[PDB]
PDB file of C-alpha atoms in Angstrom:
ATOM      1  CA  UNK A 275      13.822  13.213 -14.700  1.00 14.43           C
ATOM      2  CA  UNK A 276      10.604  15.215 -15.312  1.00 15.17           C
ATOM      3  CA  UNK A 277       7.339  13.836 -13.762  1.00 17.79           C
ATOM      4  CA  UNK A 278       4.034  15.681 -14.410  1.00 17.16           C
ATOM      5  CA  UNK A 279       0.499  14.970 -13.152  1.00 15.80           C
ATOM      6  CA  UNK A 280      -2.281  17.309 -14.462  1.00 17.25           C
ATOM      7  CA  UNK A 281      -5.964  16.950 -13.420  1.00 18.92           C
ATOM      8  CA  UNK A 282      -9.063  19.051 -14.211  1.00 17.00           C
ATOM      9  CA  UNK A 283     -12.618  18.831 -12.815  1.00 14.12           C
ATOM     10  CA  UNK A 284     -15.231  21.186 -14.331  1.00 11.59           C
ATOM     11  CA  UNK A 285     -18.908  20.867 -13.329  1.00  8.28           C
ATOM     12  CA  UNK A 286     -22.298  22.509 -13.066  1.00  9.59           C
ATOM     13  CA  UNK A 287     -23.050  20.221 -10.050  1.00  9.40           C
ATOM     14  CA  UNK A 288     -20.540  17.842  -8.388  1.00  8.28           C
ATOM     15  CA  UNK A 289     -21.028  15.645  -5.273  1.00  6.53           C
ATOM     16  CA  UNK A 290     -19.150  12.953  -3.278  1.00  8.53           C
ATOM     17  CA  UNK A 291     -21.194  11.083  -0.606  1.00  6.76           C
ATOM     18  CA  UNK A 292     -18.680   9.210   1.643  1.00  9.47           C
ATOM     19  CA  UNK A 293     -14.929   8.668   0.959  1.00  8.87           C
ATOM     20  CA  UNK A 294     -11.754   7.380   2.782  1.00 10.98           C
ATOM     21  CA  UNK A 295      -8.039   7.741   1.957  1.00 11.83           C
ATOM     22  CA  UNK A 296      -4.853   6.237   3.482  1.00  9.46           C
ATOM     23  CA  UNK A 297      -1.750   7.718   1.696  1.00  9.83           C
ATOM     24  CA  UNK A 298      -2.307  10.648  -0.773  1.00  9.85           C
ATOM     25  CA  UNK A 299       0.349  12.512  -2.852  1.00  3.79           C
ATOM     26  CA  UNK A 300       3.905  11.475  -1.767  1.00  5.12           C
ATOM     27  CA  UNK A 301       6.411  12.880  -4.327  1.00  4.70           C
ATOM     28  CA  UNK A 302      10.129  12.330  -3.590  1.00  4.25           C
ATOM     29  CA  UNK A 303      12.981  13.774  -5.674  1.00  2.00           C
ATOM     30  CA  UNK A 304      15.805  11.334  -4.814  1.00  2.00           C
ATOM     31  CA  UNK A 305      13.835   8.338  -3.381  1.00  2.00           C
ATOM     32  CA  UNK A 306      10.412   7.235  -1.951  1.00  2.00           C
ATOM     33  CA  UNK A 307       9.752   4.171   0.271  1.00  2.00           C
ATOM     34  CA  UNK A 308       6.311   2.915   1.407  1.00  2.00           C
ATOM     35  CA  UNK A 309       5.920   0.062   3.953  1.00  2.00           C
ATOM     36  CA  UNK A 310       2.139  -0.388   3.991  1.00  2.00           C
ATOM     37  CA  UNK A 311       1.161  -3.270   6.358  1.00  2.00           C
ATOM     38  CA  UNK A 312      -1.970  -2.342   8.439  1.00  2.00           C
ATOM     39  CA  UNK A 313      -4.349  -4.723  10.278  1.00  2.00           C
ATOM     40  CA  UNK A 314      -7.190  -2.936   8.465  1.00  2.00           C
ATOM     41  CA  UNK A 315     -10.922  -3.388   9.258  1.00  3.25           C
ATOM     42  CA  UNK A 316     -11.872   0.148   7.992  1.00  5.67           C
ATOM     43  CA  UNK A 317     -15.431   0.787   6.663  1.00  5.34           C
ATOM     44  CA  UNK A 318     -17.068   3.412   4.382  1.00  3.60           C
ATOM     45  CA  UNK A 319     -20.911   3.514   4.460  1.00  2.00           C
ATOM     46  CA  UNK A 320     -23.297   6.040   2.847  1.00  2.00           C
ATOM     47  CA  UNK A 321     -26.970   6.694   1.888  1.00  2.18           C
ATOM     48  CA  UNK A 322     -27.447   9.584  -0.523  1.00  3.58           C
ATOM     49  CA  UNK A 323     -29.780  11.879  -2.555  1.00  5.06           C
ATOM     50  CA  UNK A 324     -28.152  13.942  -5.385  1.00  7.58           C
TER      51      UNK A 324
ATOM     52  CA  UNK B 275      14.686  16.179 -11.038  1.00  2.93           C
ATOM     53  CA  UNK B 276      11.348  18.012 -11.530  1.00  2.17           C
ATOM     54  CA  UNK B 277       8.106  16.645  -9.992  1.00  2.00           C
ATOM     55  CA  UNK B 278       4.862  18.550 -10.732  1.00  2.00           C
ATOM     56  CA  UNK B 279       1.269  18.021  -9.569  1.00  2.00           C
ATOM     57  CA  UNK B 280      -1.454  20.395 -10.933  1.00  3.84           C
ATOM     58  CA  UNK B 281      -5.169  20.117 -10.006  1.00  7.71           C
ATOM     59  CA  UNK B 282      -7.969  22.560 -10.965  1.00  7.15           C
ATOM     60  CA  UNK B 283     -11.577  22.109  -9.731  1.00  4.71           C
ATOM     61  CA  UNK B 284     -14.421  24.340 -10.968  1.00  2.71           C
ATOM     62  CA  UNK B 285     -18.097  24.092  -9.961  1.00  2.00           C
ATOM     63  CA  UNK B 286     -21.375  25.981  -9.914  1.00  2.00           C
ATOM     64  CA  UNK B 287     -22.392  23.794  -6.891  1.00  2.00           C
ATOM     65  CA  UNK B 288     -20.064  21.376  -5.049  1.00  2.00           C
ATOM     66  CA  UNK B 289     -20.702  19.133  -1.992  1.00  2.00           C
ATOM     67  CA  UNK B 290     -18.688  16.557   0.027  1.00  2.00           C
ATOM     68  CA  UNK B 291     -20.773  14.465   2.445  1.00  2.00           C
ATOM     69  CA  UNK B 292     -18.325  12.823   4.911  1.00  2.00           C
ATOM     70  CA  UNK B 293     -14.602  12.132   4.251  1.00  2.00           C
ATOM     71  CA  UNK B 294     -11.529  10.761   6.163  1.00  2.00           C
ATOM     72  CA  UNK B 295      -7.840  11.045   5.347  1.00  2.00           C
ATOM     73  CA  UNK B 296      -4.750   9.525   7.052  1.00  2.00           C
ATOM     74  CA  UNK B 297      -1.566  10.919   5.351  1.00  2.00           C
ATOM     75  CA  UNK B 298      -2.000  13.862   2.891  1.00  2.00           C
ATOM     76  CA  UNK B 299       0.696  15.634   0.794  1.00  2.00           C
ATOM     77  CA  UNK B 300       4.254  14.565   1.862  1.00  2.00           C
ATOM     78  CA  UNK B 301       6.840  16.075  -0.566  1.00  2.00           C
ATOM     79  CA  UNK B 302      10.503  15.159   0.249  1.00  2.00           C
ATOM     80  CA  UNK B 303      13.337  16.587  -1.895  1.00  2.00           C
ATOM     81  CA  UNK B 304      16.157  14.155  -0.950  1.00  2.00           C
ATOM     82  CA  UNK B 305      14.062  11.248   0.428  1.00  2.00           C
ATOM     83  CA  UNK B 306      10.685  10.080   1.840  1.00  2.00           C
ATOM     84  CA  UNK B 307       9.920   7.046   4.037  1.00  2.00           C
ATOM     85  CA  UNK B 308       6.408   6.021   5.180  1.00  2.00           C
ATOM     86  CA  UNK B 309       5.940   3.089   7.624  1.00  2.00           C
ATOM     87  CA  UNK B 310       2.165   2.695   7.687  1.00  2.00           C
ATOM     88  CA  UNK B 311       1.100  -0.138  10.053  1.00  2.00           C
ATOM     89  CA  UNK B 312      -1.983   0.917  12.094  1.00  2.00           C
ATOM     90  CA  UNK B 313      -4.485  -1.396  13.664  1.00  2.00           C
ATOM     91  CA  UNK B 314      -7.261   0.440  11.779  1.00  2.00           C
ATOM     92  CA  UNK B 315     -11.006   0.130  12.640  1.00  2.00           C
ATOM     93  CA  UNK B 316     -11.820   3.617  11.217  1.00  2.00           C
ATOM     94  CA  UNK B 317     -15.389   4.322   9.983  1.00  2.00           C
ATOM     95  CA  UNK B 318     -16.837   6.947   7.638  1.00  2.00           C
ATOM     96  CA  UNK B 319     -20.675   7.127   7.737  1.00  2.00           C
ATOM     97  CA  UNK B 320     -22.952   9.697   6.048  1.00  2.00           C
ATOM     98  CA  UNK B 321     -26.628  10.476   5.159  1.00  2.00           C
ATOM     99  CA  UNK B 322     -27.277  13.415   2.855  1.00  2.00           C
ATOM    100  CA  UNK B 323     -29.457  15.207   0.365  1.00  3.06           C
ATOM    101  CA  UNK B 324     -27.622  17.593  -2.036  1.00  2.07           C
TER     102      UNK B 324
ATOM    103  CA  UNK C 275      15.441  18.975  -7.345  1.00  6.19           C
ATOM    104  CA  UNK C 276      12.155  20.889  -7.908  1.00  8.43           C
ATOM    105  CA  UNK C 277       8.837  19.707  -6.290  1.00  6.12           C
ATOM    106  CA  UNK C 278       5.595  21.611  -7.199  1.00  9.05           C
ATOM    107  CA  UNK C 279       2.022  21.067  -6.022  1.00 10.61           C
ATOM    108  CA  UNK C 280      -0.606  23.507  -7.445  1.00 12.83           C
ATOM    109  CA  UNK C 281      -4.318  23.310  -6.527  1.00  9.09           C
ATOM    110  CA  UNK C 282      -7.237  25.615  -7.441  1.00  7.74           C
ATOM    111  CA  UNK C 283     -10.871  25.449  -6.298  1.00  8.88           C
ATOM    112  CA  UNK C 284     -13.376  27.896  -7.824  1.00  6.77           C
ATOM    113  CA  UNK C 285     -17.041  27.622  -6.848  1.00  4.18           C
ATOM    114  CA  UNK C 286     -20.318  29.561  -6.771  1.00  5.81           C
ATOM    115  CA  UNK C 287     -21.491  27.351  -3.820  1.00  2.37           C
ATOM    116  CA  UNK C 288     -19.171  24.880  -2.004  1.00  3.06           C
ATOM    117  CA  UNK C 289     -19.883  22.800   1.150  1.00  2.00           C
ATOM    118  CA  UNK C 290     -18.226  19.994   3.199  1.00  2.00           C
ATOM    119  CA  UNK C 291     -20.544  18.306   5.762  1.00  2.00           C
ATOM    120  CA  UNK C 292     -18.089  16.409   8.030  1.00  2.00           C
ATOM    121  CA  UNK C 293     -14.389  15.629   7.350  1.00  2.36           C
ATOM    122  CA  UNK C 294     -11.332  14.281   9.345  1.00  5.10           C
ATOM    123  CA  UNK C 295      -7.586  14.415   8.606  1.00  2.57           C
ATOM    124  CA  UNK C 296      -4.592  13.021  10.624  1.00  2.00           C
ATOM    125  CA  UNK C 297      -1.325  14.205   8.920  1.00  2.00           C
ATOM    126  CA  UNK C 298      -1.639  17.168   6.484  1.00  2.00           C
ATOM    127  CA  UNK C 299       1.096  18.801   4.336  1.00  2.00           C
ATOM    128  CA  UNK C 300       4.608  17.690   5.510  1.00  2.00           C
ATOM    129  CA  UNK C 301       7.282  19.232   3.202  1.00  2.00           C
ATOM    130  CA  UNK C 302      10.973  18.332   3.869  1.00  2.00           C
ATOM    131  CA  UNK C 303      14.082  19.430   1.909  1.00  2.00           C
ATOM    132  CA  UNK C 304      16.651  16.776   2.955  1.00  2.00           C
ATOM    133  CA  UNK C 305      14.524  13.866   4.277  1.00  2.00           C
ATOM    134  CA  UNK C 306      10.993  13.007   5.561  1.00  2.00           C
ATOM    135  CA  UNK C 307       9.997  10.048   7.794  1.00  2.18           C
ATOM    136  CA  UNK C 308       6.424   9.060   8.823  1.00  2.00           C
ATOM    137  CA  UNK C 309       5.827   6.142  11.259  1.00  2.00           C
ATOM    138  CA  UNK C 310       2.035   5.848  11.284  1.00  4.73           C
ATOM    139  CA  UNK C 311       1.085   3.012  13.702  1.00  5.40           C
ATOM    140  CA  UNK C 312      -1.983   4.074  15.799  1.00  3.69           C
ATOM    141  CA  UNK C 313      -4.696   1.771  17.178  1.00  2.00           C
ATOM    142  CA  UNK C 314      -7.363   3.828  15.387  1.00  2.00           C
ATOM    143  CA  UNK C 315     -11.123   3.458  16.121  1.00  2.00           C
ATOM    144  CA  UNK C 316     -11.977   6.973  14.735  1.00  2.00           C
ATOM    145  CA  UNK C 317     -15.434   7.721  13.294  1.00  2.00           C
ATOM    146  CA  UNK C 318     -16.556  10.431  10.892  1.00  5.77           C
ATOM    147  CA  UNK C 319     -20.363  10.687  10.993  1.00  2.50           C
ATOM    148  CA  UNK C 320     -22.623  13.277   9.322  1.00  2.00           C
ATOM    149  CA  UNK C 321     -26.328  13.986   8.605  1.00  5.60           C
ATOM    150  CA  UNK C 322     -26.806  16.844   6.203  1.00  3.46           C
ATOM    151  CA  UNK C 323     -28.926  19.110   3.924  1.00  5.28           C
ATOM    152  CA  UNK C 324     -27.056  21.071   1.166  1.00  2.80           C
TER     153      UNK C 324
END
């Protein structure tokens, strides 16, 4: 079992104006289990110039 | 088993204007378990010029 | 088992104007368990020039 993720960003100018993230990279060799059951009322709000 | 993540980011100018993150990188060789059940009212708010 | 995460950032100018993070890198050889169940009312707020 070979799993590969490759990502590039190349920029003159790059911007992100507000972001939110719950579970990011979770690699597991033998096994992975996720039990995602929040009472979620989370908000992301932004006003931007770019 | 062989799990690979590669990420390159290149910029002349780069800006992040507010961010929030709950669980980041969680590599487990034998096993991983995640039991994600918050009561979540989290906010991200931002005002920017870039 | 082989787990790899590789990340590069290269920048002339780089800025982050406000950020928040609960659980960062959690590497485990045999097993990893995360039981994320907070009553979370966290705010990330920022006002910025960049």
